[PDB]
Enzyme design. Structure first.
Site, PDB file in Angstrom:
ATOM      1  N   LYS D 156       0.789  -1.219   0.000  1.00 19.79           N
ATOM      2  CA  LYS D 156       0.000   0.000   0.000  1.00 19.79           C
ATOM      3  C   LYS D 156       0.822   1.269   0.000  1.00 19.79           C
ATOM      4  O   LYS D 156       0.312   2.301  -0.428  1.00 19.79           O
ATOM      5  CB  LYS D 156      -0.930   0.063   1.207  1.00 19.79           C
ATOM      6  CG  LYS D 156      -1.925  -1.059   1.335  1.00 19.79           C
ATOM      7  CD  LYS D 156      -2.893  -0.767   2.445  1.00 19.79           C
ATOM      8  CE  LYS D 156      -2.183  -0.567   3.760  1.00 19.79           C
ATOM      9  NZ  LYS D 156      -2.054  -1.835   4.487  1.00 19.79           N
ATOM     10  N   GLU D 182       2.180   7.118  10.731  1.00 14.54           N
ATOM     11  CA  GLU D 182       2.875   6.005  10.087  1.00 14.54           C
ATOM     12  C   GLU D 182       4.362   6.108  10.421  1.00 14.54           C
ATOM     13  O   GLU D 182       4.761   6.906  11.270  1.00 14.54           O
ATOM     14  CB  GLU D 182       2.584   5.989   8.583  1.00 14.54           C
ATOM     15  CG  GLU D 182       2.465   4.595   7.981  1.00 14.54           C
ATOM     16  CD  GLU D 182       1.412   3.736   8.638  1.00 14.54           C
ATOM     17  OE1 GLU D 182       0.337   4.257   8.963  1.00 14.54           O
ATOM     18  OE2 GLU D 182       1.649   2.529   8.817  1.00 14.54           O
ATOM     19  N   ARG D 183       5.186   5.276   9.785  1.00 11.06           N
ATOM     20  CA  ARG D 183       6.589   5.162  10.167  1.00 11.06           C
ATOM     21  C   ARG D 183       7.368   6.395   9.744  1.00 11.06           C
ATOM     22  O   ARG D 183       7.269   6.831   8.600  1.00 11.06           O
ATOM     23  CB  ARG D 183       7.209   3.925   9.533  1.00 11.06           C
ATOM     24  CG  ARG D 183       6.544   2.635   9.880  1.00 11.06           C
ATOM     25  CD  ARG D 183       7.343   1.490   9.348  1.00 11.06           C
ATOM     26  NE  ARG D 183       6.624   0.237   9.458  1.00 11.06           N
ATOM     27  CZ  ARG D 183       5.921  -0.303   8.479  1.00 11.06           C
ATOM     28  NH1 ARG D 183       5.850   0.314   7.322  1.00 11.06           N
ATOM     29  NH2 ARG D 183       5.285  -1.441   8.658  1.00 11.06           N
TER      30      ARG D 183
HETATM   31  N1  ADP Z   1       6.657  -4.007  -6.958  1.00  9.94           N
HETATM   32  C1  ADP Z   1       6.373  -4.545  -5.756  1.00  9.94           C
HETATM   33  N2  ADP Z   1       5.209  -5.184  -5.537  1.00  9.94           N
HETATM   34  C2  ADP Z   1       4.845  -5.793  -4.396  1.00  9.94           C
HETATM   35  N3  ADP Z   1       5.689  -5.649  -3.329  1.00  9.94           N
HETATM   36  C3  ADP Z   1       6.885  -5.054  -3.386  1.00  9.94           C
HETATM   37  C4  ADP Z   1       7.314  -4.433  -4.637  1.00  9.94           C
HETATM   38  N4  ADP Z   1       8.519  -3.897  -4.419  1.00  9.94           N
HETATM   39  C5  ADP Z   1       8.823  -4.161  -3.125  1.00  9.94           C
HETATM   40  N5  ADP Z   1       7.848  -4.840  -2.502  1.00  9.94           N
HETATM   41  C6  ADP Z   1       7.879  -5.298  -1.094  1.00  9.94           C
HETATM   42  O1  ADP Z   1       6.578  -5.362  -0.535  1.00  9.94           O
HETATM   43  C7  ADP Z   1       6.567  -4.709   0.725  1.00  9.94           C
HETATM   44  C8  ADP Z   1       5.316  -3.855   0.856  1.00  9.94           C
HETATM   45  O2  ADP Z   1       5.444  -3.059   2.027  1.00  9.94           O
HETATM   46  P1  ADP Z   1       4.924  -1.557   1.983  1.00  9.94           P
HETATM   47  O3  ADP Z   1       4.007  -1.470   0.812  1.00  9.94           O
HETATM   48  O4  ADP Z   1       6.162  -0.711   1.979  1.00  9.94           O
HETATM   49  O5  ADP Z   1       4.129  -1.257   3.358  1.00  9.94           O
HETATM   50  P2  ADP Z   1       2.654  -1.745   3.802  1.00  9.94           P
HETATM   51  O6  ADP Z   1       2.864  -2.624   4.996  1.00  9.94           O
HETATM   52  O7  ADP Z   1       1.997  -0.448   4.176  1.00  9.94           O
HETATM   53  O8  ADP Z   1       2.040  -2.491   2.658  1.00  9.94           O
HETATM   54  C9  ADP Z   1       7.821  -3.858   0.805  1.00  9.94           C
HETATM   55  O9  ADP Z   1       8.538  -4.133   2.003  1.00  9.94           O
HETATM   56  C10 ADP Z   1       8.691  -4.288  -0.328  1.00  9.94           C
HETATM   57  O10 ADP Z   1       9.839  -4.941   0.195  1.00  9.94           O
HETATM   58 MG    MG Z   2       2.929   1.284   4.729  1.00 11.98          MG
END
Ligand code: ADP
Ligand code: MG
Ligand code: ATP
Ligand code: MG
Lengths: 467, 187, 509, 471
Positions: D156, D182-183
């Site tokens: 997200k 958030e963080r």
């Molecule tokens: N293109 C991508 N699609 C899906 N996940 C990804 C992609 N690139 C990185 N990620 C990983 O998926 C995780 C999603 O976490 P993030 O979206 O940052 O926070 P949240 O917990 O709010 O969803 C990230 O830590 C990342 O390492």
């Molecule tokens: Mg997040």
């Protein structure tokens, strides 16, 4: 009994501060200065000459300071022989608007149980006349029944056929007590009862005494509807000595309304959300239905099982009092069999040879057996084939087909619909007919001639006429 | 509603509700130094085996404890705003807490010129030359035009000193200082 | 125990003297305001459930009569009420404008005007808190009420004077079963007959404002806002305005019941009144129950949904039909509020989101839906064809597992997989297209009689649209011989045989 | 100054004050004296004997009873205007980026009312972002409201920082990012991801974004009012100037959830599972000020945390009505490597309609969703019968459905540090054409690994030739 000003109105809970004549608990008050009667039933004492009570109509337009009297007794209701064919709510007022109920003496709705040395000690069997109910799940006298099966099964036609059988051989009138019922369906019940013959708007030839507490009436006035339909039911036990019936529709809305009263006062709830006094409140209602030395009260109660949970706290507590069950299922109506009674899932606690005898037990255990294996080999004949079962399995096809059509019966209260005359069979005519199908004396009879007859001499008579 | 004069104690509970409604009502019309003389005369007629027999009796009547004290509070000496107050407590049901309010009004009225006394806790008592200093060097602290008061209580478990409490101050000089020599045994 | 009105300013005046300056029989000052709940010292003559009227112009409603104060819920914001504000009385239970000057207008839950046309011109009033009729002034329901949906009119029918619960999960098609129930009535509501008209009301409880604004424009363009009142307690309001809003709309639709007319009301949805009541109880410190609902919350939806009645000839011959909407949470029809309202009403229509993506829209489950009245609330021709149709779509459900991997079955079981998938293709229907009743008796007559078995299942939803446009234009004289006679006689049962077979030839091209 | 009250009872983060002269109304601001930092308390209840019950906006350490409290005469007054662009701001409207003060000439008190029924623009549009699941299956709308659901760790903050790249650079109107708890790590990337990308310019006046940041190291009374400092800057751009705005909020579940942290300390009986009894009232007071009136427009994108992947929780399930478009990310899909994780059978828009998007866009996206619900009825057969028992028609379904499932995945540009691929941005006319052909049968002769992580369908045949040359 004195005059008390009001001092608090919160919801369906009124708070009355007397001066001298402090009423006991379960005393009915009457508010003065209003349009129609608003009663209040005293439930606690709080000190400082203050009681607290549960209202039984709408609590609007009540001013802090109104003067409310005291009847000096509980809710007193018109109890008589001229109350049959009428309708009244929880506090005795007529609501069919046919004229006031002209009666001589009144009775309060709160009493105590029968005494320890007033009981009866020899169990007897109340015959109704229905073929499946007399044999495979017999009623006691003084006993309690459960009726399972909602709308669309052939249910109200069973209720009116009970009342037109209890007054043709036993002589005891009945009560209907709809607890929290639908106003739309209280009128199709009234208007079907008129055209069927149990209530008659002309004369002294009625059988039922409707007591309708309905769904838009406050929770304090929904719990007390099975007591007002019990108080009427005792004049035909105490003061007349007959075999009363009593229908409650249904036993879950009695229980659910007790949990609403108990949570408007402030009591901390029990397991899954019910009231702490759940078994005593059912106790003080269900113990007043016994077989005393004068007469008896029988009861027939419909049960709703929430979330298909047979161990839920409300049907667990109700099953502790039952002496029978009746199950109406959707599938037996499709076969064409009336009333829709499932003879494998309907029980009776007095099914035992010391209570019903030796002849009645070794038939209702035999005809209970022949219908169990047919449900088993309703799969082998459904996959493998027909002629591949044995020659001794061409008799469990016959004698489990000839029997489950002789569990059907032309009722009398639906006289114009079927066009056939309503038949009654006594209890020795149920037993004389079921034994001869397992014995196979009538093995040369087609499975359609066992349909909607009375005694054993009619099925045979019916077969001869055919073709 | 209206604003009211702030009492200089501000206690809480069922006392300080009624014991501030009396302080605010009597500070209007400057009826303050008078009313304590009248509250100390009902503070004697409450303790009577006929008056206290029904001032705390539940079962007499809700009403007859109102006329019996209103006839009593008016005839003998006084008809100030206290005659309404005794009629106010009795109309509500707070007759049991009636000695609590006057002990609450007394501590509220005392601080209008008082001190909330100190408590010297030393030993068997002393002479005049060492006490009249401590009844005068304890006046050098406050300095607000006041006339001090005091309590004395003898305790021997304090071996060799005196503790004193000017309000909530507690300057302690005693034989607690043996426990403070834990630091010798504490590395 | 201290008591609420035992504060240091109430006792302080009683020590001074008698309270002649304020009278307290009619006006009472406010002790403490917080989160839309006030506490008022005084007002000795206030009746229970009486509107009061605060000092800053807002209104109120009296709910807790207590031995030293009264607790009154506030309509509107709470930043206008304070401590020390005089409250007065009006002298009555709350009342709302009612007439026929509401038709085509958009009103809130107090009867005011929001669409900006102008003030309402009615000369009548009504109290919101009245009672149902009794056992006697009603009669059993016999009038068809038509929706225009081939599923709702043929499998779970509604009558006039009946409750029917629209229950189902989120994003399923709930608001859209009840928006061509409205649009379908324009067939009858412009003609000359009077005992076939209908006047609809839509109640929106807690929705956002710009979903109502997308609904007055859906209904204007389809020309059905000349007989539709819109009552709208939306989400930004106070909590008691959303509590009154189905009583305010059930008194607007009782004037049409007392006068020999007919109506239909749509509560949307009743699972946000019950949360608006619960916020009000637990700040008045009424004791909770299961899921923190108060004890009297079956008493909310029982005294409301029993005012829908079918009166009789000696009282006028009116009606009122109610369709309440309830949203479950992941198929859980065993929570607290979804089990009150299933017990009260007369049937439910159950929409699932699994069927919505498998290509069946409107996404009606037929197995988990019922109407308790049913076959008496239908016309004599829709009764004729659906008695063969409801049975045969029920035999398909028992053999519906075999269809995935099956060709080595019996020819009878391969028949129920055949006929049952043609009747499922008939019941599909596009959004905002209600149908006339005798036209649906044409389409359903084709499938259940045998004139669709020799076709391909993606050619069923084309054949229906080509069969209808041929029979509207070139056979309009026979779609008024069912709309008048009612029952399909044999002289029409032999004439539709010469239409479908003489169209099934010249179709596949 | 007026009504200089005094503090009496600091129990948690709920301070009660007592006023001698003038009682302030509900929803005001109070200023605790004698502190080197600015602590602001907002009035919430009136108790009797002139005491109110407030809520602090900072730390309650060092609060000695009997401390003076001033009064301003209004709710909290933030800065607003055009000069708030390229800035980061506090809940009470202060700088937190150490660039100096905000010099504006107009203040807006953060408590306003929802605009009426007769100020509601009715028109729908379409909006193209570039993603083959958004633009095909749950399309956006110019001025609509958009919510991004899903659990923790499903994608997200990536899907919301990719739409900031796609839409909020090729846009003429302005944007606001409000960070509601958030963080603080993730609030340092987006400050620096957009300095090098030109959206923030630290020397001239051509920035096109404004930032509001109150994070999860903040007391739970200040994590309930950065949701409202957001849509007060994002309303001056819609109402006063007649412009067009975009609204980005992450995360809006921390507005509800920080109201359950002071419910019982205020004096209420708690409701069902632990939330305050004013859930759907304080929420709908806020989610009606985010609307498009007839003076401007707002396109709002809000991230919505679903706690413990439980969608029937009362904090998400009362937010499904304040929104036009829902994109629900699942976790059982992102475990298969498919990215974006978006559930095809659970996202939904209002304008999926054969009269706005056209009757070719509509027939495609109602056949993608129909072949994916046909897949799941076969997956229960495969678990018993195995794959080589099925018939030859049902084998054709699973192969296309796995081709469609892999083709819904797309490499974002912000996954150029995570996966090492290169980013796509597919136009809408190619999205409809590509999916139309896989359903037809015109790519039945390829391996599935061609379709994983491509853009247009012409790149999914330029991979099946490289796999066959390197064989
Ligand atoms: N293109 C991508 N699609 C899906 N996940 C990804 C992609 N690139 C990185 N990620 C990983 O998926 C995780 C999603 O976490 P993030 O979206 O940052 O926070 P949240 O917990 O709010 O969803 C990230 O830590 C990342 O390492
Ligand atoms: Mg997040
Ligand atoms: N019969 C139908 N055919 C095609 N689409 C439909 C049909 N019924 C509903 N829809 C679609 O369903 C979508 C949402 O339906 P709707 O919002 O009316 O249902 P709902 O369950 O009331 O949703 P909510 O409860 O969130 O208001 C609409 O975008 C509409 O396009
Ligand atoms: Mg809806």
């Amino acid at each position: 009994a004195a005059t008390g000003r009001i001092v608090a109105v919160i919801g369906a809970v009124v708070d009355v501060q007397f001066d001298e004549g402090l009423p006991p608990i379960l005393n009915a008050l009457e508010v003065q200065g209003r349009e129609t009667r608003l009663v209040l039933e005293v439930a606690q004492h709080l000190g400082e000459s203050t009681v607290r009570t549960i209202a039984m109509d709408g609590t609007e337009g009540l001013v802090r300071g109104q003067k409310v009297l005291d009847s000096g007794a509980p809710i007193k209701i018109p109890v008589g022989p001229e109350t049959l064919g009428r309708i009244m709510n929880v506090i005795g007022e007529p609501i069919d608007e046919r004229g006031p109920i002209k009666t001589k003496q009144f009775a309060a709705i709160h009493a105590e149980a029968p005494e320890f040395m007033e009981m009866s000690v020899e169990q007897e069997i109340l015959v109704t006349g229905i073929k499946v109910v007399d044999l495979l799940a017999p009623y006691a006298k003084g006993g309690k029944i459960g009726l399972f099966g909602g709308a669309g099964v052939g249910k109200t036609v069973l209720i009116m056929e009970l009342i037109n059988n209890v007054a043709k051989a036993h002589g005891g009138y009945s009560v209907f007590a709809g607890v929290g019922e639908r106003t739309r369906e209280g009128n199709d019940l009234y208007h079907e009862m008129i055209e069927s013959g149990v209530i008659n708007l002309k004369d002294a030839t009625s059988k039922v005494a409707l007591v309708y507490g309905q769904m838009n009436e406050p929770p304090g006035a929904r719990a007390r509807v099975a007591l007002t339909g019990l108080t009427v039911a005792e004049y035909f036990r105490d003061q007349e000595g007959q075999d009363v019936l009593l229908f409650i529709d249904n036993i879950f809305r009695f229980t659910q309304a007790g949990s609403e009263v108990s949570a408007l006062l402030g009591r901390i709830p029990s397991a899954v959300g019910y009231q702490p006094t759940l078994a005593t409140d059912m106790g003080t209602m269900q113990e007043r239905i016994t077989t005393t030395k004068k007469g008896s009260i029988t009861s027939v109660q419909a049960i709703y099982v929430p979330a298909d949970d047979l161990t839920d706290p409300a049907p667990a507590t109700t099953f502790a009092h039952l002496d029978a069950t009746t199950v109406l299922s959707r599938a037996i109506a499709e076969l064409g069999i009336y009333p829709a009674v499932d003879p494998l899932d309907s029980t009776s606690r007095i099914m035992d040879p010391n209570i019903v005898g030796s002849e009645h037990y070794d038939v209702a255990r035999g005809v209970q057996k022949i219908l169990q294996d047919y449900k088993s080999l309703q799969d082998i004949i459904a996959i493998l084939g027909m002629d591949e079962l044995s020659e001794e399995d061409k008799l469990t096809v016959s004698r489990a087909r000839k029997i489950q059509r002789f569990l059907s019966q032309p009722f009398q209260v639906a006289e114009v619909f079927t066009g056939h005359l309503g038949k009654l069979v006594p209890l020795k005519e149920t037993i004389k007919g079921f034994q001869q199908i397992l014995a196979g004396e009538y093995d040369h009879l087609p499975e359609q001639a066992f349909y909607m007859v009375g005694p054993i001499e009619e099925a045979v008579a019916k077969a001869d006429k055919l073709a | 509603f209206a604003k009211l004069v702030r009492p200089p104690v501000q206690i809480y509970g069922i006392e300080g509700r009624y014991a501030t409604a009396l302080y605010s009502a009597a500070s209007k019309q400057n009826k303050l130094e008078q009313v304590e003389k009248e509250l100390l005369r009902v503070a004697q007629i409450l303790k009577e085996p006929k008056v206290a027999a029904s001032i705390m009796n539940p079962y007499v009547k809700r009403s007859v404890k109102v006329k019996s004290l209103s006839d009593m509070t008016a005839k003998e000496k006084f008809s100030p705003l206290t005659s309404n107050l005794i009629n106010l407590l009795a109309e509500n049901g707070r007759l049991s807490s009636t000695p609590g309010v006057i002990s609450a009004f007394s501590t509220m009225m005392s601080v209008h010129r008082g001190e909330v006394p100190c408590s010297v806790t030393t030993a068997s008592p002393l002479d005049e030359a060492t006490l009249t200093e401590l009844k005068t060097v304890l006046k050098s602290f406050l300095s607000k035009g006041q006339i001090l008061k005091l309590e004395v209580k003898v305790d021997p478990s304090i071996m060799g000193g005196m503790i004193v409490r000017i309000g909530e101050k507690y300057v302690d000089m005693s034989a607690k200082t043996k426990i403070q020599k834990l630091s010798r045994a504490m590395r | 125990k201290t008591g609420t009105a035992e504060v240091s300013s109430i006792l302080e005046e009683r020590i001074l003297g008698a309270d002649t300056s304020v009278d307290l029989e009619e006006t009472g000052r406010v002790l403490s305001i917080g989160d839309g709940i006030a506490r008022v010292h005084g007002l000795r003559n206030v009746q229970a459930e009486e509107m009061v009227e605060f000092s800053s112009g807002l209104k109120g409603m009296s709910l807790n009569l207590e031995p030293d104060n009264v607790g009154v819920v506030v309509f509107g914001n709470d930043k206008l009420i304070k401590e020390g504000d005089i409250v007065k009385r009006t002298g009555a239970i709350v009342d709302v404008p009612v007439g026929e000057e509401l038709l085509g207008r958009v009103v809130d839950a107090l009867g005011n005007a929001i669409d900006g046309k102008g003030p309402i011109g009615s000369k009548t009033r009504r109290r919101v808190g009245l009672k149902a009729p009794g056992i006697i002034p009603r009669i059993s329901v016999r009038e068809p009420m038509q929706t225009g949906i081939k599923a709702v009119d043929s499998l779970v029918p509604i009558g006039r004077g009946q409750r029917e619960l629209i229950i189902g999960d989120r994003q399923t098609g709930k608001t859209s079963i009840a928006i061509d129930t409205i649009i379908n009535q324009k067939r009858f509501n412009d003609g000359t007959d009077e005992k076939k008209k209908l006047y609809c009301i839509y109640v929106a409880i807690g929705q956002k404002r710009s979903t109502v604004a997308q609904l007055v424009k859906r209904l204007t363009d389809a020309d059905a806002m000349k007989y539709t009142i819109v009552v709208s307690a939306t989400a930004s309001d106070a909590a008691p305005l959303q509590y009154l809003a189905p009583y305010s709309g059930c008194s607007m639709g009782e004037y049409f019941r007392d006068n020999g007319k007919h109506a239909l009301i749509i509560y949307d949805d009743l699972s946000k009144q019950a949360v608006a009541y619960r916020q009000m109880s637990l700040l008045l410190r009424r004791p909770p129950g299961r899921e923190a609902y108060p004890g009297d919350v079956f008493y909310l939806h029982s005294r409301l949904l029993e005012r829908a009645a079918k009166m009789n000839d000696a009282f006028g011959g009116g009606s009122l039909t109610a369709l309440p909407v309830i949203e479950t949470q992941a198929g859980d029809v065993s929570a607290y509020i979804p089990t009150n309202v299933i017990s009260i009403t007369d049937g439910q229509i159950f929409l699932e989101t699994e069927l919505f993506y498998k290509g069946i829209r409107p996404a009606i489950n037929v197995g988990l839906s019922v109407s308790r009245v049913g076959s008496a609330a239908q016309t004599r021709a829709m009764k004729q064809v659906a008695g063969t149709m409801k049975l045969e779509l029920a035999q398909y459900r028992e053999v519906a597992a075999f269809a995935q991997f099956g060709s080595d079955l019996d020819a009878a079981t391969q028949q129920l997989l055949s006929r049952g998938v043609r009747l499922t293709e008939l019941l599909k229907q596009g959004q905002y297209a209600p149908m006339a009743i005798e036209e649906q008796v044409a389409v359903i007559y084709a499938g259940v009689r045998g004139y669709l078995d020799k076709l391909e299942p993606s050619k069923i939803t084309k054949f229906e649209n080509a069969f209808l446009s041929h029979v509207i234009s070139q056979h309009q004289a026979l779609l008024g011989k069912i709309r008048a006679d009612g029952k399909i006689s044999e002289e029409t049962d032999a004439k539709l045989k010469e239409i479908v077979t003489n169209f099934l030839a010249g179709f596949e091209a």
